[PDB]
Symmetry: D3
């Protein structure tokens, strides 16, 4: 039992899927996992552990922003023996060729947060995902006939940034998606010796927003979820 | 209707109490407000609006960390016309004379986050509360026979900080409590021309943790809540 | 005695009013203090001790800038037993609604300086005044039929700054006035465990571009001193 | 031609291998390329063009340090149509489990340099390699019966640094190797829209304190070059 | 007349000697200048203009700290036709072989102030003296038979620095004297287009703690004055 | 023998002239030194030792960029008894009155590199040349009838800077030449206890874009060489 997770060692699987702000952990568990049991309820942050094709897997949200996900990912790693963390959420795009509903894999994550500088003696720590997890996600996506773009994400501290010019800079440097967690999670993974990966589905254009109906949402979200789950089975092979 | 608040202008009162990680908005509304109606449900972030001694007041959680509360406080201010925001939560203490269950008023909030430097051309922005709100809280506390200490809080980005030496620095400079939101909220209030105040109840010692039973928790939490609500009535006078 | 103050313990009261201009200190002592005696003249930084309505009080200039006032306030606190430093100065206006001859109280002080970062491990230290001293000042002002605005001041290192764009940033975030010492004094007070407050009269509006010239300006300046002196009396009671 | 490269469009292939040591470039061309011709000699930074298994390939030194390699990679990309820069160098080991003669692939590169901050508005830019080039390299290594570790490299500005405490920080956060160019090259690739990858052989273990001397060391160095060359062939297919 | 100097174009010579202490400027005028006339007394910052062997010369205090002297030097340069500023101050020694009353000439000035970073886009501006002025001072000292070291000074914002270790770093890099103005003055000279030089007399030793002592005290503060005045004549020839 | 120099104590003179281009070091040795003998060829960084009017002198390239020259200058100072380093390089002019082939002497060197901040606890280290060396060079130039400006150089990390505006700031502060090594060399000289000086020949103009031209080209690159060599003899006397 930790300060924010009311569970015990063994309650969570070695692999944890963490739903972004959209997806719900309860939805993932009852739709993709079999024999799911509830392992956490603190702050309504429902956690679940079940199996996917015989493989043990847990699911639990990470909350909005670096400070929030940093809490949970740290405790899962040091107190519940979790080895892999896969975040599945949404992101905004700044690149014209990146479209609404595209799946983006964050091999790296830029940020305007100060958490990584505090850890790295104020130098540049390249917040990156585990390579194998990236390749598993990409391969699982190809197997499902889904084209997944791999590159940098940008984890912002302020959803409502005062500096609108930064989005242009992001576009110039190839950032595929803007979210608020990746860099924080990768920082924790490196700090405590674990592996992590962030997968996002473009929910909107920070430029010229398109128009995909609610029917064209849960269908793409299920895709990202399958990618995540299937990528885990590939990693075991 | 905003990106994270599914409500319309008028749904929230001009004054909003935002519960810290402990307290629940639903609890506050059904225990201290009369005729409360639900005004928000997005992401299970329940919002409520009712009255306290005839005074219109809304309550809704802000989530963990600066990035999270920055979202909600900004939208409440610019899209729902909110003028005052009062955060009520818990904090850790570094000072020996500051005890478990003491009420602390954050006239100012230090931080290791970069959000205020991004707003203030990388200079030092003194993240402060509205003076009148501070004095109202203090006076309301005296009226209830509660001694409230006023000073600096510290809003950390990392609950699990790699630099343990910083707590000593905090103690040396008189920080009364460690939390993760104040500086973020004060930053938003100043950016969009509103007023804000953070009130915390010491939940633990980052030094030698005491032992206050669960009976010695909800009793102090109710105190902080009353302080907050009564401080609003004083502000109207 | 120290290299900058040629006096001995006891020569100063436990409360010291400090204007930037040393000649202003002589003006204060001759105008409001009874039985005032000069207690320092090193570097021409005149210091005086006398009584106001029977209360022992000292007044001494602190010079221009954070580095200057930092030396004097520090020595006053650690070598002369001073417990309170009120600074009485002038500030430049940035907000259009802050008019000439307006009394401003600095609950907090933003800054250009790196002194607080040096003290606070390169993080954001919210440089604040002592709460009770601020409240005492507002009440003293009220009793004198004067409206006092409480908020943020900005302590600049460069009176003649090359970045003219900073003034708009200051206005956006509600800075009430621009001066050059508050943040330094508040840093010292916290570092050495004392209490401080900065009170200013607006002598110029950087907006409409206008300084001062009138018997009314000198009236407002005296009102600030009266607020300072009376506030210490309220503090004792 | 430019002030640093005396060649014309066409003289270089669209893919360039780049070791730090210009004499190493001559070694590569003579050992693995057929019909190799010297295409640059300015400042002694030898460049060569030939073919590997019928594929046009170029190889040129980039000199020591981020500032040096930044000029060459930039010119190669904007003036000679180069689309891929693979760097083949040596790195110092920080992790005890990373042994001598180990092939390291830099998916990301941390750094001491301020170049990416200059480019990215003083924020954290995650300097990463191109995903497909990394994957191509791992597969080429696999086909050659070689284990390749993929992760973070650290690009230092000072080979002789005064802060010896940084090496422990590097180890804690899992840096696989220390070199001096990766982050600079990755910054250039992103700024000018090209693709890059850095591959290194561990020539020394800063831990147990040991460099190299053996026919086995030269064997591993050749294996890295073979991995680089074969990986570009896989990239075309 | 400027905001801090009540004088008129022509009241000052084109070269001004400036100690931090206004009273020292008074001593210099009465002891080394003929027909000395006071030209300023605002804020007690005494300024004088006279003759030295026929050369029109001025001497005026600049106060303590970069912010203070920045104001005076600036106004003198933009409104009184001042071409050369020669600071004649005191400094704290950090090196073992430097003793009280030793004369140091600062061709460069390090600092922990942020003023030059604000002027130089946050990069490193090498705050240096005018070369010819340094050479004139070195020559004048030789002809006078007075020893003098030439090198880097360190301009501190905090006389009472909370970072004791920094003195070791200063010693390591050969800092000759610790004062509080040089870097600022050099910054102003470069920004407003004039020439400046700082000459200091070791006022005390930071390691041994031996402050000024014996009649020898000011006697060397005479040496630096003579060197400054004679350097001016040399510069004219 | 050091990691980058295959030579032995005694192979180098106590003073070394260092251009960035190894081939230029070769030209200098063959054109100005008698009995020139190659003493290093590692990484192609040609080093030579010979005689100039009887004085033993060495000349060796240091490569492009602060990181590169930091390595060579350091090793020469700690393992080959080198007391003086004289960089003889090229630079880009930013001021209108500075033309191609003008000789500049850098008594100071600004920079956007982070190396000195890493050495100086993140404060501003004034990277300066040895005063006597500057004076020797100025005198040697006078006797040679060669014009030469003395002032600040700017050592850039990025030749292809993404920040064009910075050149305007450089111009404003009187930067005489933009190169890429001076600040680093000065940092090394101070850290390891030696003396250094940088002399540059305007290689081109950043505003007009006129790079090297006419036979006059290297002819002035001869002027700086003559000045450097003659300055050494002057320094010996
Ligand atoms: C454009 C944009 N900017 C910032 N965060 C974004 C975003 N688009 C999607 N997100 C993701 O959704 C949540 C935010 C709070 O809406 C967060 O959970 C976040 O990861
Ligand atoms: C010691 C300590 N450190 C950081 N946050 C603390 C804290 N004590 C209480 N908090 C508050 O409770 C939540 C954290 C996430 O537990 C957050 O909501 C926070 O405001
Ligand atoms: C507009 C403006 N900018 C900067 N400082 C200002 C100011 N208006 C007033 N001050 C105050 O007066 C002094 C400066 C030196 O003149 C200082 O003591 C300072 O506190
Ligand atoms: C331990 C260690 N530290 C720094 N750089 C190192 C290193 N081990 C190898 N390198 C690589 O080799 C070059 C340095 C110049 O010798 C550089 O090209 C660099 O990439
Ligand atoms: C040890 C030490 N540290 C900092 N400044 C010092 C010093 N010793 C002398 N000075 C110089 O004298 C003044 C200080 C405030 O006494 C200042 O004007 C300053 O330039
Ligand atoms: C315009 C400009 N900017 C930066 N460096 C410049 C320059 N003009 C000349 N240099 C000097 O020559 C080398 C550069 C890489 O060509 C480097 O060795 C450098 O010192």
């Amino acid at each position: 039992a930790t300060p924010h997770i009311n569970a015990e060692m063994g309650d969570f699987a070695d692999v944890v899927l963490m739903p972004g702000d959209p997806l719900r952990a309860k939805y993932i568990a009852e739709t993709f996992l079999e024999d799911a049991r509830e392992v956490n309820n603190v702050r309504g942050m429902l956690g679940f552990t079940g199996t996917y094709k015989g493989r043990k897997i847990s699911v639990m949200g990470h909350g909005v922003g670096i400070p929030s996900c940093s809490i949970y990912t740290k405790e899962l790693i040091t107190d519940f023996g979790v080895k892999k963390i896969i975040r599945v959420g949404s992101c905004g795009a700044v690149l014209p060729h990146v479209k609404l509903r595209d799946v983006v894999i964050g091999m790296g994550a830029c940020t305007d947060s100060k958490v990584n500088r505090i850890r790295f003696k104020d130098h540049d720590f390249a917040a990156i995902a585990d390579f194998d997890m990236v390749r598993n996600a990409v391969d699982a996506a190809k197997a499902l006939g889904i084209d997944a773009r791999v590159g940098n994400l940008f984890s912002a501290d302020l959803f409502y940034s005062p500096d609108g010019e930064m989005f242009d800079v992001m576009e110039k440097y190839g950032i595929l998606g803007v979210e608020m967690e990746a860099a924080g999670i990768y920082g924790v993974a490196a700090e405590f010796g674990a592996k992590a990966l962030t997968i996002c589905t473009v929910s909107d254009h920070i430029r010229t927003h398109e128009q995909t109906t609610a029917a064209e949402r849960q269908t793409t979200f299920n895709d990202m979820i399958k990618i995540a789950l299937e990528s885990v089975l590939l990693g075991d092979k």
